[PDB]
């Protein structure tokens, strides 16, 4: 006679889900077979005055129910004036901030800020290694990237780049060319500790918004340095090990790193049309450049396919396509060939964009987002990555965000948004047809979700190799 | 051959769940036919430091997905330090806001705080008035409660109480007796406003916990003026018209107030072995006393029947059972008449603490929370209105807090909220056969929950009536 | 036969006198030229319960007789503790209010409280701006000084100061040094509002009193943050435009901003053997800090000369001077120097301290508060303001406060206030010849007066360049 | 002179060593002046000391061998609705209750609270406070609650008091004094531990807010809110014949005062106001406690009542329906039942209530009165002086708006007197010089002083302050 909603969660497994919540303050894990949120925190209970909790990953725990760890970052300043709210705090926090936190089967607990104890503060994409001794946070404010060791939340290694362009006029300062630097970052204060927590280090004062390198050439993005800006994204890794890839969205480029030997070794070329690869040139040990003699489009989303054999970066917005490399050879990245670019009609606009994708455990199928603006239903498209073509699209909702997948492979797992200020939920989608099985509520405004790992190689299909 | 948890919404009806989420800082409404988030909105983000969104109450639309309002509050100062989770917080908010919402069928927009409109801030039970012309509060630390304008946000009519013992000793203060005076609150202020918000007025430094009688007897409850204190909880309304019931945790005693003539008319003695009612005496046009020989038990819960017939009033600490009187007679309060107790060898002084409970539209039954401490499973007692016994408990998990129903009577919907910071959930229980059907994934500490009513006879059912 | 006082007012001109009563709770104006009151409001009326009627500034009106408007700031808290008086009220309003009253012909009209509109209450002095198109307030418990607009009574700028002590030991926290820091301080709430009302923001529990540098040095000033006060007093203003000085009495320096580009431009440094400036450095685009090496003496009375051409600042602990810049370059005041000092072989450390001083027309000559604790007689210093010197010193009786001139330079207007519980009256003397004409009845405990003027011209002598 | 600028001391120096105190009513204060040297001595705000209605109302001084060494006054206040009925838009909608009467001292220095005498005693009053002729003591009326009393200036408890209670022959609120009644003469006892009175604050009120002038029309039209107005009397005072052993209580709405023996705790005799009606009414004995009086008609209210310095006249003014002064030979002082209506002033300028003349004050040898003259707004407001001899109005001043009180400095040299603004205009000190009435200025007084006086030297120098009139 009644349903019971706990028939749907007894298909799904033992699974759990974790996400942010961006303007709402706080950070969440589900259970997914039963439907309880596990425990939430809300980081204003800690004196946070700009709590966006941005961007997240977990540590594999062989049982997450009875504890795991994670890395939650926030964001701060003008930040907090670019979404739909109309909000009242004229001088925020500065956020930047690097939570580490501690779910232990029962709540959660706030262990410290790793932007405190490096003294290096990052506010884009945070990544575990696929080792899970360490992580990796982004930030395209102030451009730098690094990867900190998971037991003392110090640097293992940073770096900065800077963009020197052909011609000194926002308007063409990306498109018609220029250098980028790619420099070591050192620490200056005792201990090994950087000077760079909240706002020290950025060049604009807001990460740059879905088509906003638009916005940026416009001037209106403010900022000390607008000219001088990459918008790092994120530093992704190769789950063979040894190598990491950090994204760089303005100059459509990917830098990647010897994670040893701390040195860049190959920058990718993003847009559809350039060769697979620009050439990377040593400057002194501690700087390289690359020449870059037009950028043709910006780009996004970058990963790697869970055995290692595929590198995708995404051109967005004036091309939008995901181009894809052969990294099947190992030993050696400036070996790295681009060989397919996925290109289709659900693609002929500015927008959608996406940003987002999850792998398959098999590396098959790939799950990637339609983001647009307000009022346009975003939601999925689903990519045969084996023939690199678009198998499937799936309208969901407003503000389409990040995806997981649980590491069975059989049920996609998301999150949309509402801009900040409309509706948000979960969304569960089976792999098997491709069909979407329905939302659960989500009073968030997540721009990232993981499912907690149990081992190391669910990291490959996790917030690890891509985001 | 998956199963879709659309099938699940399907049942529920096209119902909207809205609750706030205390510790979280943030309030959501929800879509039951569909399982996503409709909005959310974070205080935070309006400059508000100790969003501790407390109570709330929604007032009918005649189509709440196109439009709804709703009040709800908050509590600040050393409510934030009264839970498990290790704050940090030098200088919080004093709390009190009463903000004032409205969801436009897109966002939720804060519209003002009525606490600084009115200069009245009160930080416990939000009720809608039985017309939906206006609101009350009342507030345990200040022992103050109000009837307000809809429209204007001004008060209507305010009442203060205070208590004097008969042994001025905390251990003794309420056991052995005293008398409680009733005093026409009027404002001091240019426009009519009172000069009391945030912490003014404040005799006590946070809102009484389950069982926190003891606390304040055993000194371990801070404030200026604990031996005055009375811990006023609602102010309830007769879903008839006429009348509103002010609760008083503290004498064990409700105050039937006339809001029309602006007088209180009865007293409603608590607990069994005391009489109907005590005796109040006027001492001047502004000013009223009542004579408590003894305090035998603190009372919490209060509330009528959709119809009015019967008025409840719980006790919940020396005493744990339900006291009901027969209201049948609209004339005339001071003919109320004890007619019924539940009790249950169950129930055992302080817990199960029955804070919160709903009728079914016919009111043949009622449910009613059923509160421990962790780790004790809380659940929900079913009780049969017209025999007046216990029928059915069921167990759900920790920290059961508000009961709601859908206004065709079908489903009971229900929060849990993990004492702020472990499991939380949105429960659903079908009231044909008292089954739970589940759980739905809820990120907040929620101590309310209403659902959205369409029409004035819904409001007999929601957050009007009971509490 | 008899001896009519209307010969003495006959001399006085059409000038009427205003001035607030402390300890009184309320605010007078009187007409010099018959003798009466013309009006006079008391606080407690309007629901005020700690009408420490302050600080008060007056707008020009060509007609004082038929109207004329001023703005009157309060004290509370435990400013209510620490005079003479043995007061009984135990839970006092925290003041910080700024009233805007506005005489009408006939009676006072309370038009409101501006920090209720704006959101910022502050207690110290009160000052129009050059313009007459808004008015400025500094407090000293907060170490906020702000620019409000007149018709909205919203603020234009605010400022928010803190100091950082080299030795973090009250007793040496001044004269061992440190760094100031000077923020621009920026609204939180709904409409640009602050949240700074009453003791919202206080790092100490009453203003300084005369000499009390070494009452906080001693640990005997209370409060939430006494090693991070400044004690800022004042905000005055350039007669020539663009320029506003805020004094800051515990590290002695005045700080100068460009009220236009609200950023700081110079930091004067008071103690006679201190450079003229201390170097503004700038950490951000709204933070600024200087160091300051050793406090040599706390400042306090700070303003111009009427032609701008003169900056004084007088020391008034560990020194007992005035100093005195050369301000006549407008365009910048990074190269205003040290001129002269005023010395007296009479003045030595605290006392006479001398807190209020008002120029004649032609700006020749200064006539300066000598205030002492009970019983030596305070008085008046006339100063030659082309030699530097003091010409003349008259006794006059019990507390000493502010000064005024009528606006044709005739006669100087004072009131002396009893220390709130014995002699008090307003006295006159004459220009000339700087001898005391009489004195007129004054029942209130004035640490303020004005002469309303009639002219902007008339500004440059009253509550706006000096105090 | 030696300059040419005049000297404000010049002023002060022909007033003698005289010490002005006035309370200020809506500004919640009282004050001290040296007339001398024009400085405020001292002055106290009553919101310092918690009170939530600080209206600071009636007051006076005992005498004092130095008053710049240190002098003693009471000082009471009004609260409740009074409140309410000025030009000022209060917000306080529940204000303290008021009634209270404060013992206050110069100390040479500053004023000091000594306590409050409703507090001790448990009777709260709010209208005029009077000195004993002996200085051994106080009095205070009031024409809410319709009592006076004498307290004992050493130990402030009660040595007497009266309550007054109408009985109109018509239960109308029109006619309830127009058509007559009967007023009781209650003597009031202790009903608590300790001899104290249960009467502070409101406890006792039948009406709101005292009468203002004019205020019967308020009254008779029911728009005077409270328990029992048709039992009100609006008691005003209790004035002290110079000669000892007589009070006299003044009663505004049935237009009489009632003569007590101070002594002996009883009622005497019942002086009938209005012209035209007899000397006296006849005092009717019920009980030991109890006395009435018949009044077949109420003619007019009346006010002012007071006795001339040397005793020898008594007056009462008649103020609504008839607006002149009442005189009574009063030179037999062993039975005041003798005391006989002996003259009457009136003017062509004074018809029905305005000008009010509810304040006087004589000069030390009784040849002529100072009287107050009040009009609503806007008509200027004045002194008349009465030639006391001929009971003739000598001449007529103009000064401005709401004259309140008159005090005589106490070689009847200068009346000093107060405007008050109606709480909200403008307020001031005036000094009149007696030789030839001339108007010689104003003061600054940011104050609502309903009352003033000089403080006394000594027990003679009462006879013409704030003991023998109001
Ligand atoms: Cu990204
Ligand atoms: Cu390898
Ligand atoms: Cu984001
Ligand atoms: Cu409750
Ligand atoms: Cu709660
Ligand atoms: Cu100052
Ligand atoms: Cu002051
Ligand atoms: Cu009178
Ligand atoms: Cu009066």
Same mark, same amino acid.
């Given at each position: ?366 799950? +990637?987002?339609?983001?647009? *603006? /307000? !009022? ?5 498209? #689903? =990519?045969?990555?084996?023939?690199? &073509?678009? $198998? ?43 069909? +979407?099985?329905?939302?659960? *509520? /989500? !009073? ?5 979700? #993981? =499912?907690?790992?149990?081992?190391? &190689?669910? $990291? ?8």
């Amino acid at each position: 006679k009644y349903v019971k909603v706990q028939d749907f969660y007894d298909q799904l497994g033992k699974y759990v889900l974790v996400a942010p919540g961006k303007f709402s303050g706080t950070v969440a894990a589900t259970d997914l077979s039963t439907g309880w949120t596990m425990a939430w925190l809300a980081a204003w209970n800690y004196g946070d005055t700009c709590p966006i909790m941005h961007h997240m990953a977990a540590f594999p725990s062989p049982d997450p129910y009875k504890e795991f760890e994670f890395v939650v970052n926030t964001q701060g300043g003008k930040n907090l004036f670019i979404y739909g709210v109309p909000v009242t705090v004229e001088d925020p926090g500065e956020g930047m901030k690097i939570y580490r936190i501690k779910y232990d089967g029962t709540r959660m607990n706030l262990q410290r800020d790793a932007a405190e104890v490096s003294g290096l503060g990052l506010g884009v994409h945070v990544t575990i290694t696929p080792e899970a001794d360490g992580y990796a946070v982004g930030d395209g404010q102030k451009d730098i990237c690094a990867e900190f060791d998971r037991e003392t939340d110090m640097v293992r290694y940073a770096w900065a780049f800077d963009w020197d362009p052909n011609v000194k006029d926002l308007k063409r300062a990306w498109l018609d060319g220029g250098t980028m630097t790619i420099k070591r970052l050192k620490p200056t204060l005792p201990g090994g500790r950087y000077d760079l927590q909240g706002s020290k280090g950025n060049k604009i004062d807001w990460e740059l918004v879905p088509g906003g390198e638009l916005a940026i050439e416009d001037g209106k993005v403010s900022g000390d340095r607008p000219l001088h800006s990459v918008a790092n994204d994120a530093l992704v890794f190769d789950p063979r090990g040894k190598w990491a890839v950090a994204s760089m969205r303005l100059p459509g480029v990917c830098v990647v790193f010897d994670r040893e030997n701390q040195v860049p070794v190959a920058v990718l070329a993003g847009p559809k049309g350039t060769p697979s690869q620009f050439q990377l040139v040593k400057v002194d040990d501690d700087t390289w450049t690359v020449d870059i003699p037009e950028v043709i489009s910006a780009g996004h989303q970058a990963g790697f396919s869970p055995d290692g054999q595929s590198f995708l970066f995404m051109n967005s917005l004036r091309q939008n396509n995901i181009m894809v490399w052969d990294s099947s050879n190992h030993d050696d990245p400036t070996t790295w060939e681009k060989k397919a670019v996925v290109e289709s009609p659900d693609w002929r606009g500015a927008y959608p964009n996406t940003f987002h994708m999850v792998f398959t455990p098999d590396a098959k199928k790939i799950y +990637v987002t339609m983001w647009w *603006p /307000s !009022p346009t239903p975003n939601g999925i498209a #689903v =990519i045969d990555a084996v023939n690199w &073509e678009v $198998l499937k699209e799936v309208d969901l909702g407003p503000d389409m965000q990040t995806l997981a997948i649980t590491y069975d492979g059989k049920f996609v797992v998301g999150t949309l948004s509402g801009y900040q200020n409309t509706a948000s939920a979960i969304v569960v989608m089976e792999t098997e047809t491709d069909e +979407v099985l329905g939302f659960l *509520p /989500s !009073p968030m405004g997540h721009h990232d979700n #993981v =499912i907690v790992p149990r081992t190391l &190689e669910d $990291l490959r299909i996790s917030r690890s190799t891509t985001t």
